[PDB]
Design a binder for this molecule. Sequence first.
Ligand code: TG1
Ligand code: TM1
Ligand code: NA
Length: 994
Amino acid sequence: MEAAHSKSTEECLAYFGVSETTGLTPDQVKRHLEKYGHNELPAEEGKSLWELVIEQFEDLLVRILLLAACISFVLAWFEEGEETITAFVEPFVILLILIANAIVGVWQERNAENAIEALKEYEPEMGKVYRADRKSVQRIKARDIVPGDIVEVAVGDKVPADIRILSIKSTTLRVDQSILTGESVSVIKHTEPVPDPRAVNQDKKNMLFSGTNIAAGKALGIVATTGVSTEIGKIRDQMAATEQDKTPLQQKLDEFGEQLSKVISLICVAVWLINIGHFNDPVHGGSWIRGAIYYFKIAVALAVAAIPEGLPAVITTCLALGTRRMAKKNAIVRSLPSVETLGCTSVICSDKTGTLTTNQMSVCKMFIIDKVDGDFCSLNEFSITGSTYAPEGEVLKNDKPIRSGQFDGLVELATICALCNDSSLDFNETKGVYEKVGEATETALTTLVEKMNVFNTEVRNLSKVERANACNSVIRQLMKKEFTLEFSRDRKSMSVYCSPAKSSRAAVGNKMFVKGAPEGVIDRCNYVRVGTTRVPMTGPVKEKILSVIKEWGTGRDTLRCLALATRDTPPKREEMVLDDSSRFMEYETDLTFVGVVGMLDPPRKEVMGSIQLCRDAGIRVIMITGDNKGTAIAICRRIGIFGENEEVADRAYTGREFDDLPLAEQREACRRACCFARVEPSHKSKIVEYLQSYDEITAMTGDGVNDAPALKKAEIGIAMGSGTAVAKTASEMVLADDNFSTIVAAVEEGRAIYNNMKQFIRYLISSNVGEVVCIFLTAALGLPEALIPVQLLWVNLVTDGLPATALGFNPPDLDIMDRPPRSPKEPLISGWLFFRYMAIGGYVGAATVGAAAWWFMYAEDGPGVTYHQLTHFMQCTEDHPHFEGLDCEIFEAPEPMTMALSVLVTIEMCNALNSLSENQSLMRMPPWVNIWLLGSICLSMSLHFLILYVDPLPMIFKLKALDLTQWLMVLKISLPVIGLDEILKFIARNYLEG
Ligand SMILES: C/C=C(/C)C(=O)O[C@H]1C(C)=C2[C@H]([C@@H]1OC(=O)CCCCCCC)[C@@](C)(OC(C)=O)C[C@H](OC(=O)CCC)[C@@]1(O)[C@H]2OC(=O)[C@@]1(C)O
Ligand SMILES: Nc1ncnc2c1ncn2[C@@H]1O[C@H](COP(=O)(O)O)[C@H]2OC3(O[C@H]21)C([N+](=O)[O-])=CC([N+](=O)[O-])C=C3[N+](=O)[O-]
Ligand code: NA
């Protein structure tokens, strides 16, 4: 029964055919269990280890690498040498890389924590029901409860299903619903129907929600819904159905993969088309077997040269380090890839209270009526100092301290403030600073009366915990508080019924004290207090009062106003139905207006500055608040979201107003709106949807279970440090200090990290192009392999991995926050840059092939076969152009591989320098601009010597220590790559200056 809150108790019992005093029969149980299922959220998909190891092997590039591993393994077998250790090395490396990769992918899943699974914290194991088969209450497993069940709850219980309250067995039933409604104070429950079939949860005062807690009392109820149908179950379904997108870089990486894979196959076809003349060779002689091994050897080298194998690790390392840095600035990033998205944020939607403001509420203005004489009226206005919940402050009229007690009107104002109040003050001795005990707005009052000290009680003598509630305790001794009519959003007021404490043979002199939003309270005043006297409420007195409230609430003071009032002749106690909240407005009629208080929940000190940073960075800020609309807009003006004087008629919306717009107008509202007031949790989700319809990258704040869906939907869900764990697990980021400014600082960090990532992505991928040209050159010209997979793999994982990682530490540009958000669709490499890496690639390909071919020919350590061309053969049974001797297999020498490799290494060190800046010359942005980079380059070269010298390794990699002559050639050919880039950077910096 979804609409239970709107049905009578009788109607709810009738629907399920259940007797309140017996409960369900066992036939009913069996039928209801079959119809409605068990009372639980569906279990998580069992994702197995085998099913998960396989997912690691779904990435296209890892597939290519696996294919290459198999050809490399197959080749290690069907071979012609004798060395048993040196062969199976290659396929083991690739295999090991794929395995280490899988190990990690798996680590991340056993440690992954999901939001839907965290909701289960809120289902209790047991609940209590009355069923026909037994007289006494039976404790059963929550999961076996069904709709129609008669259930019983008591103080401390976790609510087990969504239950319509039948009977409250205690004096009141108080419930902790904070997780679902964001109501901090436990809320009173009743049993009468709530008429609106579409009531929001906060109005469902006759309902208990699954997952919430009984704070006081004992109650009988009938189970309305279970499982996925409860409020929290529907929240679990909304999250389930939300599909999150791959980040822009993830999408680019996949696109890169697809294309790279297409290029690879194309180059194979090319290497085939280029050696098509082999169909002209006599079938007799030669070696097909030794030719086919040659095409497969290069296919493997091609695969290895194309993939940036070390890239995922560099990306991960850079992200972890950034993450650690962000945490020191209160931004706890939960998802490493979100860092990029955060850098792209174009809208931040932020709750106000506690995030944009300190949530330290403090009264700084109040007034009572001074006098009323026909058309004439005056008010007595005061200021109150002290922005803390601490009783540190004093009252002033025209900036001069006064005695509060010397105004009877004030005495009553404080009386109402103290009695009509569920909250209080605590002096927390672990911290020193005072903390709210309840609602913030109420504690401001508590704090007010202490500062007012209307009866002049001796407080300078008391301590610091005896200070928290002194002047309050005085006022309590005055009146017996009988009951309270709790605040509700329809009437926007609350009241207390009181009778004199000292009261002999007198049934008379009871008072109700009423506090609430001014408009409805004032409309219900027929009288105005003036000192201790009373006079009829009339037009010019009302004008005067509403006029001041308008200025305090809509002006630059941005205060929340409450009107305070007393009913002088309240109804007889017995003539009041305390059980029907619908009558409460009526009990609070025929009131006497006493006064108005104005309180401020001040903006955080950094907020103004961060709002400005957002405007500078092209990031829109939307405030979401529970203030009325007028005060909402005033506060937006105050912190600079709106200009002091700009028109905002269609840039601010209440939840009400927004609902009244047709769908098309709502989408349009979201694109221009900066302020939403009094909105429901559903609105945050709609706002995010509409914003995603204009391709915004949106951050949204949240704290409760009710915020979880919207946090999941937003590109950057942002949870409060002080909030629920469910909100945390549904978010990309947590603010450990709750501060909006932490968001802005995280975004800037995102922008700077990403700009560095660009450089190292471009740097690593650039070398892969360079490597492929080498392999394709080698197979084009019929040359001996200049580089083998194992070498390339060391370079891609280690040699270039360090400088790439160092490029992550590139100093950020000074104008990072002076530019619009980066377009998500913006390519990492395109246009002129494409051409640059085209040219570098071609250079690098030529330079490596060159060095190997130079050794074979013009080098005097090797067989100076100058223009003798390796082109000719790698056959060696024809022995044509060696007219006399007995030596041939020098085609497998490690020296020319060492030439190529040291060229590759050196060029890449050079190109790491080229990568410090996209377009700035090294003459303006020198190498020492990044110490880590120089440091890494020294480390890579050291390691290059390691594999050249440390004996097990030279043999493994097939290399031989170079000559001082040969190193000098390495440098001769490698260094110019700097010249080429410096020229190319020059061309971009000058003939594209528009
Ligand atoms: C990795 C190694 C090679 C050899 C491969 O060619 O990479 C290409 C490739 C896949 C792209 C290209 C490479 O394209 C070429 O080099 C032209 C083909 C030359 C034929 C060779 C014949 C001997 C990148 C690498 O380089 C150059 C020089 O322009 C740029 C960029 O890469 C990126 O933007 C990085 C995105 C992660 C991509 O065009 C990208 O494809 C895309 O979708 C992008 C948008 O990704
Ligand atoms: N949709 C709404 N409709 C009406 N009032 C609302 C609404 N949403 C919030 N409020 C008011 O805005 C608050 C939370 O702000 P945030 O930090 O969440 O943006 C609320 O505090 C009081 O009224 C609530 C209140 N109370 O019990 O809730 C009792 C009051 N009282 O009489 O003691 C008055 C409150 N008040 O706002 O003045
Ligand atoms: Na999200």
